[PDB]
Ligand binder design. Structure first.
Ligand SMILES: Nc1ncnc2c1ncn2[C@@H]1O[C@H](CSCC[C@H](N)C(=O)O)[C@@H](O)[C@H]1O
Lengths: 265, 265
């Protein structure tokens, strides 16, 4: 009669909360989705070993089209867990699943976990200064989406930071790198000429948040565009004007050039 | 030797990540602060029992004025952990503490935990649509903070949602309720008269996120301003223009008036 939405956290199998783990262990059935994002620091096998139960993986179609035929029927007479990378319901499509549960007469509860949305606090940038967020999508064929560029423009003009989620082909486990994102943005700039993203733009790259050894780097595009930030996942942030405290953290912790202390504050 | 900043999560001792728990258990000294937020579902004793270590609680003065005199000295020859509610670097000034650690020649690591900043996803509002955030602070003496009103105005004009952290005076055991925040906002509205926050404004309240049964309510200020949302902590949200699915979730899950389903595109 109960469905638990449980977050797995940021990077590996230990990023789930104690609450999430203990509840998952006592569930009769455990399902999981890895299409909204991936858990780069672990494997399905390691998550399964930790929880001590078979993990039934579901595709985007299984969920979006058949959630009520696959998960809810069992949740009706058993305790069922639905694992998701990060924090449940951050992904835009997850919320509606609780309405499906209600419609089916199934109680649902949410067990939170760390999300990249909040983990970016490790960049030293003040969380309250983050504006609207966006996703940088790979252009394909004759389609060249650029809405993320406008998001940066609107946040930056108001002195706000912009969190940029990078494209991920979950199924193929292929990640867009911060370098690729920077090239795209430079390409978009050359087309819109909005003076939003150039070689002189200060950016912050956060890779493998959740790991004990994430890569946190800050600097100008001209210098970071060909830098190796390590294995995925990568997150790109275009900060707005900096509070001196934010700048000092970027210099001392993220290796930012001293120049940001006088150019970006 | 090393210093770990470990988040404890949203509501109780089990909101800590497995990674955080396993590391805390092996530290030589464990310190913590409980003034940045309120964990309403646990006690110091329960946290101490879970980690199996005595926890030395520090006050705001201890941290802000003497972190480098109380904590860092021990981290030079021991493994030390500093625990905090929620995520250690969200809506706190703890990031600066990493700079102090560096200058003291101490390596520091960050272990994330569920944060209210991302847990708001449980309201059904799209996380990427949240703009700049703000804090509603208690007026003191002749000083009456009003910056949060302008943040709402700015976000709303862009169609973005506004997350409002509510004030806390830990040593006095005072936790601002959503009701008190709404009352303060109505007063700022009468002063600035910008039509930003009125009796007809739609708001969302999230109380005790992290618990299995948090209070999630949506409705007009005139109806919710006197409603009992239960024990603190509370967070207040002023949505921008709603997507149809956001409205559906607020109606189905947060008990919002069915009329909001009819969005004015
Ligand atoms: N479980 C919870 N439910 C509702 N609001 C919460 C909450 N935890 C924190 N808050 C809100 O956030 C304020 C503290 S701000 C510090 C937040 C913390 N670092 C985190 O990551 O969550 C509180 O006064 C309250 O308004």
């Amino acid at each position: 009669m109960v469905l638990y939405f449980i977050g797995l956290g940021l990077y590996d199998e230990r990023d789930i909360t104690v609450k999430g783990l203990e509840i998952a262990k006592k569930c009769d059935y455990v399902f999981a989705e890895f299409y909204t994002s991936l858990m780069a620091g672990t494997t399905l096998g390691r998550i399964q070993k930790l929880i001590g139960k078979r993990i039934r993986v579901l595709s985007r179609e299984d969920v979006e089209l058949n959630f009520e035929n696959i998960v809810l029927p069992l949740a009706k007479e058993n305790d069922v867990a639905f694992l998701t990378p990060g924090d449940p319901l951050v992904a835009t499509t997850h919320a509606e699943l609780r309405i499906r549960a209600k419609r089916a007469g199934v109680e649902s509860y949410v067990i939170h976990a760390p999300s990249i949305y909040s983990a970016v606090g490790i960049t030293g940038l003040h969380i309250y200064k983050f504006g609207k967020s966006a996703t940088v999508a790979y252009p394909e064929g004759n389609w060249f989406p650029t809405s993320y560029y406008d998001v940066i423009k609107e946040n930056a003009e108001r002195g706000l930071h912009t969190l940029l989620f990078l494209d991920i082909k979950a199924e193929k486990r292929m990640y867009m790198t911060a370098n690729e994102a920077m090239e795209l943005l430079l390409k978009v700039e050359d087309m819109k000429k909005g003076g939003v993203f150039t070689d002189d733009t200060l950016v912050v790259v956060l890779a493998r948040a959740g790991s004990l050894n994430p890569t946190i780097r800050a600097g100008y595009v001209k210098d970071l565009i060909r830098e190796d930030f390590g294995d995925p996942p990568h997150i790109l942030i275009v900060p707005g004007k900096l509070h001196i405290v934010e700048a000092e953290y970027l210099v001392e912790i993220a290796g930012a050039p001293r120049e940001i202390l006088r150019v970006n504050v």
